[PDB]
Coordinates of all heavy atoms in Angstrom, one line a residue:
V229 N 54.1 58.8 33.5 CA 53.0 59.4 34.3 C 52.0 58.3 34.7 O 51.7 57.5 33.9 CB 52.2 60.5 33.4 CG1 51.1 61.1 34.2 CG2 53.3 61.5 32.9
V230 N 51.6 58.3 36.0 CA 50.7 57.3 36.5 C 49.3 57.8 36.2 O 48.9 58.9 36.3 CB 50.9 57.1 38.0 CG1 49.7 56.5 38.7 CG2 52.1 56.3 38.3
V231 N 48.4 56.8 35.8 CA 47.1 57.2 35.3 C 46.0 56.4 36.1 O 44.9 57.0 36.3 CB 46.9 56.8 33.8 CG1 45.5 57.0 33.3 CG2 47.9 57.6 33.0
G232 N 46.3 55.3 36.6 CA 45.3 54.5 37.4 C 45.8 53.2 38.0 O 47.0 52.9 37.8
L233 N 44.9 52.5 38.6 CA 45.3 51.2 39.2 C 44.2 50.2 39.1 O 43.0 50.6 39.0 CB 45.7 51.5 40.7 CG 44.7 52.1 41.7 CD1 43.8 51.0 42.3 CD2 45.4 52.8 42.8
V234 N 44.5 48.9 39.2 CA 43.7 47.8 39.0 C 43.8 46.8 40.2 O 44.9 46.8 40.8 CB 44.0 47.1 37.6 CG1 43.1 45.9 37.4 CG2 43.8 48.1 36.5
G235 N 42.8 46.1 40.4 CA 42.8 45.0 41.5 C 42.3 43.7 40.9 O 41.5 43.6 40.1
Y236 N 42.9 42.6 41.5 CA 42.6 41.3 41.1 C 42.2 40.4 42.3 O 42.6 40.7 43.4 CB 43.8 40.6 40.4 CG 44.1 41.2 39.0 CD1 44.9 42.4 38.9 CD2 43.7 40.6 37.8 CE1 45.2 42.9 37.7 CE2 44.1 41.1 36.6 CZ 44.8 42.3 36.5 OH 45.1 42.8 35.3
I237 N 41.5 39.4 42.0 CA 41.1 38.4 43.0 C 41.4 37.0 42.6 O 41.6 36.7 41.3 CB 39.5 38.5 43.4 CG1 38.7 38.2 42.2 CG2 39.2 39.9 43.9 CD1 37.3 37.9 42.4
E238 N 41.4 36.1 43.5 CA 41.7 34.6 43.2 C 40.4 33.9 43.0 O 39.5 33.9 43.9 CB 42.6 34.1 44.3 CG 44.0 34.4 44.3 CD 44.9 33.7 45.4 OE1 44.3 33.6 46.5 OE2 46.0 33.3 45.1
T239 N 40.4 33.1 42.0 CA 39.3 32.2 41.6 C 39.8 30.9 41.3 O 40.9 30.7 40.9 CB 38.5 32.8 40.4 OG1 39.3 32.9 39.3 CG2 37.9 34.2 40.7
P240 N 38.9 29.8 41.4 CA 39.3 28.5 41.0 C 39.6 28.3 39.5 O 39.9 27.2 39.1 CB 38.1 27.6 41.5 CG 37.5 28.4 42.6 CD 37.6 29.8 42.1
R241 N 39.4 29.4 38.7 CA 39.8 29.3 37.3 C 40.9 30.2 37.0 O 41.3 30.3 35.8 CB 38.6 29.6 36.5 CG 37.4 28.6 36.6 CD 36.2 29.1 35.8 NE 35.5 30.2 36.5 CZ 34.6 31.0 36.0 NH1 34.2 30.8 34.7 NH2 34.1 32.0 36.7
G242 N 41.5 30.9 37.9 CA 42.6 31.8 37.7 C 42.5 33.1 38.4 O 41.8 33.2 39.5
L243 N 43.1 34.2 37.9 CA 43.0 35.5 38.4 C 42.0 36.3 37.5 O 41.9 36.1 36.3 CB 44.3 36.2 38.5 CG 45.3 35.8 39.6 CD1 46.6 36.6 39.5 CD2 44.7 36.1 41.0
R244 N 41.3 37.3 38.1 CA 40.5 38.2 37.3 C 40.3 39.5 38.0 O 40.3 39.6 39.2 CB 39.1 37.5 37.0 CG 38.2 37.5 38.3 CD 36.8 37.2 37.8 NE 35.8 37.5 38.9 CZ 34.8 38.4 38.8 NH1 34.7 39.1 37.7 NH2 34.0 38.7 39.8
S245 N 40.2 40.6 37.2 CA 40.0 41.9 37.7 C 38.6 42.3 37.8 O 37.7 41.9 37.0 CB 40.7 42.9 36.7 OG 40.3 42.7 35.4
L246 N 38.2 43.0 38.9 CA 36.8 43.3 39.2 C 36.6 44.8 39.3 O 35.4 45.2 39.1 CB 36.4 42.7 40.6 CG 36.9 43.3 41.9 CD1 36.0 42.8 43.0 CD2 38.3 43.0 42.1
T247 N 37.6 45.7 39.4 CA 37.4 47.1 39.5 C 38.6 47.8 38.9 O 39.7 47.3 38.8 CB 37.2 47.6 40.9 OG1 38.1 47.0 41.8 CG2 35.7 47.4 41.3
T248 N 38.4 49.1 38.5 CA 39.5 50.0 38.0 C 38.9 51.4 38.1 O 37.8 51.7 37.9 CB 39.9 49.6 36.6 OG1 40.9 50.5 36.2 CG2 38.7 49.7 35.6
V249 N 39.9 52.3 38.4 CA 39.6 53.7 38.6 C 40.6 54.5 37.9 O 41.8 54.2 37.8 CB 39.5 54.1 40.1 CG1 38.3 53.5 40.8 CG2 40.8 53.7 40.8
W250 N 40.1 55.6 37.3 CA 41.0 56.6 36.6 C 41.2 57.9 37.3 O 40.5 58.2 38.2 CB 40.5 56.8 35.1 CG 40.3 55.5 34.4 CD1 39.3 54.7 34.4 CD2 41.2 55.0 33.4 NE1 39.4 53.6 33.6 CE2 40.6 53.8 32.9 CE3 42.4 55.4 32.8 CZ2 41.2 53.0 31.9 CZ3 42.9 54.6 31.8 CH2 42.4 53.5 31.4
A251 N 42.2 58.7 36.8 CA 42.3 60.0 37.3 C 41.4 61.0 36.7 O 40.7 60.7 35.7 CB 43.8 60.5 37.1
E252 N 41.3 62.2 37.2 CA 40.3 63.2 36.8 C 40.7 63.7 35.4 O 39.9 63.8 34.5 CB 40.2 64.4 37.8 CG 39.3 65.5 37.3 CD 38.8 66.3 38.4 OE1 39.3 66.2 39.5 OE2 37.7 67.0 38.1
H253 N 42.0 64.1 35.2 CA 42.4 64.7 34.0 C 43.4 63.8 33.2 O 44.2 63.2 33.8 CB 43.1 66.0 34.2 CG 42.3 67.0 35.0 ND1 41.4 67.8 34.4 CD2 42.3 67.3 36.3 CE1 40.8 68.5 35.4 NE2 41.3 68.3 36.5
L254 N 43.1 63.6 32.0 CA 44.0 62.8 31.1 C 44.6 63.6 30.0 O 44.0 64.6 29.4 CB 43.2 61.6 30.4 CG 42.7 60.6 31.5 CD1 41.8 59.6 30.8 CD2 43.8 60.0 32.2
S255 N 45.9 63.4 29.7 CA 46.6 64.2 28.7 C 46.1 63.8 27.3 O 45.5 62.8 27.1 CB 48.1 64.0 28.8 OG 48.6 64.5 30.0
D256 N 46.4 64.6 26.3 CA 46.1 64.3 24.9 C 46.9 63.2 24.4 O 46.6 62.7 23.3 CB 46.2 65.6 24.1 CG 44.9 66.3 23.9 OD1 44.0 66.1 24.7 OD2 44.8 67.1 22.9
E257 N 48.0 62.8 25.0 CA 48.8 61.7 24.5 C 48.1 60.4 24.7 O 48.1 59.6 23.8 CB 50.2 61.7 25.3 CG 51.2 62.6 24.6 CD 52.4 62.9 25.6 OE1 52.1 63.0 26.8 OE2 53.5 63.1 25.1
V258 N 47.5 60.1 25.9 CA 46.8 58.9 26.1 C 45.5 58.8 25.3 O 45.1 57.7 24.8 CB 46.6 58.7 27.6 CG1 47.9 58.6 28.4 CG2 45.8 59.8 28.2
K259 N 44.8 59.9 25.2 CA 43.5 60.0 24.5 C 43.7 59.6 23.0 O 42.8 59.1 22.4 CB 42.9 61.3 24.6 CG 42.2 61.6 26.0 CD 41.2 62.7 25.9 CE 40.9 63.2 27.2 NZ 39.7 64.1 27.2
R260 N 44.9 59.8 22.5 CA 45.2 59.4 21.1 C 45.2 57.9 21.0 O 44.9 57.4 19.9 CB 46.5 60.0 20.6 CG 46.5 61.4 20.2 CD 47.9 61.8 19.7 NE 47.8 63.0 18.9 CZ 47.8 63.0 17.5 NH1 47.8 61.8 16.9 NH2 47.7 64.1 16.9
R261 N 45.4 57.2 22.1 CA 45.5 55.7 22.0 C 44.2 55.1 21.8 O 44.1 54.0 21.1 CB 46.2 55.2 23.3 CG 46.1 53.7 23.5 CD 46.8 52.9 22.4 NE 48.2 53.4 22.2 CZ 49.0 53.0 21.3 NH1 48.6 52.0 20.4 NH2 50.3 53.5 21.2
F262 N 43.1 55.7 22.3 CA 41.8 55.0 22.2 C 41.1 55.3 20.8 O 40.0 54.8 20.6 CB 40.9 55.5 23.3 CG 41.5 55.4 24.6 CD1 41.6 56.5 25.5 CD2 41.9 54.2 25.1 CE1 42.2 56.3 26.7 CE2 42.5 54.0 26.3 CZ 42.6 55.1 27.2
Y263 N 41.8 56.0 19.9 CA 41.2 56.3 18.6 C 42.0 55.8 17.4 O 43.3 55.7 17.6 CB 40.9 57.8 18.4 CG 39.8 58.4 19.3 CD1 40.1 58.9 20.6 CD2 38.5 58.4 18.9 CE1 39.2 59.4 21.4 CE2 37.5 58.9 19.7 CZ 37.9 59.4 20.9 OH 36.9 59.9 21.8
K264 N 41.4 55.5 16.3 CA 42.1 55.1 15.1 C 42.1 56.2 14.1 O 43.0 56.3 13.2 CB 41.5 53.9 14.5 CG 41.6 52.7 15.4 CD 41.1 51.4 14.7 CE 42.2 50.7 14.0 NZ 41.7 49.4 13.3
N265 N 41.1 57.2 14.2 CA 41.1 58.4 13.4 C 40.8 59.5 14.3 O 39.7 60.0 14.5 CB 40.0 58.3 12.3 CG 40.1 57.1 11.4 OD1 41.0 56.9 10.6 ND2 39.2 56.1 11.6
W266 N 41.9 60.1 14.9 CA 41.7 61.1 15.9 C 41.5 62.5 15.3 O 40.8 63.3 16.0 CB 43.0 61.2 16.8 CG 42.8 62.0 18.0 CD1 42.1 61.7 19.1 CD2 43.4 63.3 18.3 NE1 42.2 62.7 20.0 CE2 43.0 63.7 19.6 CE3 44.3 64.1 17.5 CZ2 43.4 64.9 20.1 CZ3 44.7 65.3 18.1 CH2 44.2 65.7 19.4
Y267 N 41.9 62.7 14.1 CA 41.9 64.1 13.6 C 40.5 64.6 13.4 O 40.1 65.7 13.6 CB 42.7 64.2 12.3 CG 42.2 63.4 11.1 CD1 41.6 64.0 10.1 CD2 42.3 62.0 11.1 CE1 41.1 63.3 9.0 CE2 41.9 61.2 10.0 CZ 41.3 61.9 9.0 OH 40.8 61.2 7.9
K268 N 39.6 63.7 12.8 CA 38.2 64.0 12.5 C 37.2 63.5 13.6 O 36.0 63.4 13.3 CB 37.8 63.5 11.1 CG 37.8 62.0 11.0 CD 37.4 61.6 9.6 CE 37.4 60.1 9.4 NZ 36.8 59.7 8.1
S269 N 37.7 63.2 14.8 CA 36.8 62.7 15.8 C 36.3 63.9 16.6 O 36.6 65.1 16.4 CB 37.5 61.7 16.7 OG 38.6 62.3 17.5
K270 N 35.6 63.6 17.7 CA 35.1 64.7 18.6 C 35.8 64.6 20.0 O 35.5 65.5 20.8 CB 33.6 64.5 18.9 CG 32.7 64.5 17.6 CD 32.3 66.0 17.3 CE 32.0 66.1 15.8 NZ 31.3 64.9 15.3
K271 N 36.7 63.7 20.2 CA 37.5 63.7 21.4 C 36.7 63.7 22.7 O 36.9 64.6 23.6 CB 38.6 64.8 21.4 CG 39.5 64.8 20.1 CD 39.9 66.2 19.8 CE 40.1 66.3 18.3 NZ 41.2 67.3 17.9
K272 N 35.8 62.7 22.8 CA 34.9 62.7 24.0 C 35.2 61.4 24.8 O 34.3 60.8 25.3 CB 33.5 62.7 23.6 CG 33.0 63.8 22.7 CD 31.6 63.8 22.3 CE 30.7 64.2 23.5 NZ 31.0 65.5 24.0
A273 N 36.5 61.1 25.0 CA 36.9 59.9 25.6 C 36.4 59.7 27.0 O 35.6 58.8 27.2 CB 38.5 59.7 25.5

């Protein structure tokens, strides 16, 4: 499932990202990735 996209630019020190955008709705599978104790959290990702 596709979730978002990223863009990079060229700099004299390498590549670096400047923006990123996400989709409106995210599944509960991905939201589990951002937490270490998901069961007792509030799930406000």
